[PDB]
C-alpha cells in the first residue's frame, strides 16, 4: 500500500499552476508553491462519511466557503466548514461544499482562490493532490 | 539578427513543482528561440538523463521543446533540467517532480482488530482498529443493542488521534455484547466486530 497515513496532516496541491492550499492566521485563503511554508500544512477530519473539515494546522482555523462562494478560514467550525471529498476517477481530489453544493474548493492559475460559484466539475482549478507534510 | 537563447513562454514554466499521481503522463516544456536554433539536453539530477534511466524511457518533441514521460512511477521523483544553448549563450530551468500513487478503495481495517474481551465487572477493557485508506475515512465504534448504538464517532471533536482506541471503564453486565468498527469513506464502507464477555 501507498504510505501515507490517513490521520496525518497533508499539503493540498492544486494541478492548476501547481499552488499549495495555504490558510493564514488571519483567516486568508489562497495558495503558494514554496513547500516549506508553515501555513500549507493542514489536518483532514472526516465528519462523516465523505465529508471532511479542513483545518490549517498553524493558522488554527478551519477551511470556509461563504455564500457567495468566498474562501476564507475561520477559528470556529461552522456549516460552511465542511466538504464532500471525491477520488476523482483522473487520481486527484474534489472538493465540494456541502452547504453550496454545486460549489468546489479551487485555485486560480494566479495563486487566488476562486470563487465557488466560478468552479465547475470539469475545471482544474478544483483539481487536487494531497500530499504529506515532509 | 543573431541572439543568445532565450525562453518565449515562461508562463508555461511557472510552475517549478510538478506533483502527479502515479501512472500520469509528464510533460515538461521550456520554450525556447535564439538564432541561431539554440539546441537543447534535459538532466535528472544534474546528469544526462538516458533512455535506460527509467522503464519505457522517455520522449522528446523538439518543436515543442518538451520532455515527455509516459505512466510515471514513484521512483521518477527527481529534478529535471532542461539545458538551451548556442553560441551567444547558455540557460537552464529545472523542475522537479513528484509520483503519488493513489489507492481508490473503501476502507481497509487489520485483520483481528477489534479483538475479543474478558473481564469481570468493574475491569476496564479496551478495543483497538487500525484503519487504513486514501480517501479520507469516517470511523465510529457501535456496540449492538439490528439495534445498534454509536458510542463514538469521528469528527472536528474526536479527532481521529484518538478515534481508533475505545475505552470502557469499570465496565457492568451492561456493557457486554458485540462492538464494531466501522470505517467509512466515498467509495465504501467496511468494519470489524468483537465481543466483550463481563464476568461476575
Same mark, same amino acid.
Given at each position: ?16 499552476? $501547481?499552488? #499549495? ?5 488571519? $483567516?486568508?485563503?489562497? $495558495? ?9 500544512? &493542514?489536518? &483532514? ?12 494546522? +498553524? ?11 468566498? &474562501?476564507?478560514? +475561520?477559528?470556529?467550525? *461552522?456549516?460552511?466548514?465542511? #466538504? ?9 481530489? *474534489?472538493?465540494? +461544499?456541502?452547504?453550496?453544493? +454545486? ?6 492559475? *494566479? ?7 466560478? *468552479? ?15 | 539578427?543573431?541572439? /543568445? ?13 510538478? =506533483?502527479?499521481? =502515479? ?11 535564439? @538564432? ?16 535506460? !534511466? ?7 518533441? @523538439?518543436?515543442? %521543446? ?25 540557460? @537552464? ?11 481508490? !478503495? ?8 477489534? /479483538? ?36 463514538? =464517532?469521528?469528527?472536528? @471533536? ?24 466501522? /470505517? ?7 468494519? !470489524?466486530? /468483537? %465481543? ?5
Amino acid at each position: 500500500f501507498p504510505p501515507g497515513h490517513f490521520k496525518d496532516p497533508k499539503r493540498l496541491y492544486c494541478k492548476n499552476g $501547481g499552488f #499549495f492550499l495555504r490558510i493564514h492566521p488571519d $483567516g486568508r485563503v489562497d $495558495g503558494v508553491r514554496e513547500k516549506s511554508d508553515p501555513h500549507i500544512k &493542514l489536518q &483532514l477530519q472526516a465528519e462523516e462519511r465523505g465529508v471532511v473539515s479542513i483545518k490549517g494546522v +498553524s493558522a488554527n482555523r478551519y477551511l470556509a466557503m461563504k455564500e457567495d462562494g468566498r &474562501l476564507l478560514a +475561520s477559528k470556529s467550525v *461552522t456549516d460552511e466548514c465542511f #466538504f464532500f471529498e471525491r477520488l476523482e476517477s483522473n487520481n486527484y481530489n *474534489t472538493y465540494r +461544499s456541502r452547504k453550496y453544493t +454545486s460549489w468546489y474548493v479551487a485555485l486560480k492559475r *494566479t495563486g487566488q482562490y476562486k470563487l465557488g460559484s466560478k *468552479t465547475g466539475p470539469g475545471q482544474k482549478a478544483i483539481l487536487f493532490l494531497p500530499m504529506s507534510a515532509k | 539578427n543573431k541572439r /543568445a537563447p532565450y525562453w518565449t513562454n515562461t508562463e508555461k514554466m511557472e510552475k517549478r513543482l510538478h =506533483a502527479v499521481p =502515479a501512472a500520469n503522463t509528464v510533460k515538461f516544456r521550456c520554450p525556447a528561440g535564439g @538564432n541561431p536554433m539554440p539546441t537543447m539536453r534535459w538532466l535528472k539530477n544534474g546528469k544526462e538523463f538516458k533512455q535506460e !534511466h527509467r522503464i519505457g524511457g522517455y520522449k522528446v518533441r @523538439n518543436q515543442h %521543446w518538451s520532455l515527455i514521460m509516459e505512466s510515471v512511477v514513484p521512483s521518477d521523483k527527481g529534478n529535471y533540467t532542461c539545458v538551451v544553448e548556442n553560441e551567444y549563450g547558455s540557460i @537552464n530551468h529545472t523542475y522537479h517532480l513528484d509520483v503519488v500513487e493513489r489507492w481508490p !478503495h473503501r476502507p481497509i481495517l487489520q485483520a483481528g482488530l477489534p /479483538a475479543n474481551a474478558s473481564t469481570v465487572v468493574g475491569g476496564d477493557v479496551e478495543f483497538v482498529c487500525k484503519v487504513y485508506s486514501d480517501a479520507q475515512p469516517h470511523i465510529q465504534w457501535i456496540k449492538h443493542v439490528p439495534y445498534l448504538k454509536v458510542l463514538k =464517532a469521528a469528527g472536528v @471533536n474526536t479527532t481521529d488521534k484518538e478515534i481508533e482506541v475505545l475505552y470502557i471503564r469499570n465496565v457492568t453486565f451492561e456493557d457486554a455484547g458485540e462492538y464494531t468498527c466501522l /470505517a467509512g469513506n466515498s467509495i465504501g464502507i467496511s468494519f !470489524h466486530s /468483537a %465481543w466483550l464477555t463481563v464476568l461476575p
